[PDB]
Amino acid sequence: MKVGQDKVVTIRYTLQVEGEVLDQGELSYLHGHRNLIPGLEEALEGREEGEAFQAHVPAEKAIPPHATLDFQVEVVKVREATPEELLHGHAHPSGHHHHHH
């Protein structure tokens, strides 16, 4: 499945700024709901599950001022959102736990 609006996407990433690793890990987000750094979400659009890629994200689409955010990203999983995720506007952990905010 390809990354797109209303998909919950799991990525593994390393973030460098000026050549230094600042963060690394794995996260899941609901795509198309302004829940991720915009330039990173833009880089992810249309990517296939399994794809690995580098993205340069300027501060003006996202740490010192006006530095480039250099991401190394793997698309781990792509699935469709549940109705509850769509209503809440965010991704939920695998285990069903009905709730509101």
Binding site: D23, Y29, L36, I37
Partner: peptide, 5 residues
């Protein structure tokens, strides 16, 4: 917004 840094 994510990632939380």
């Amino acid at each position: 917004m994510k990632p939380f840094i």
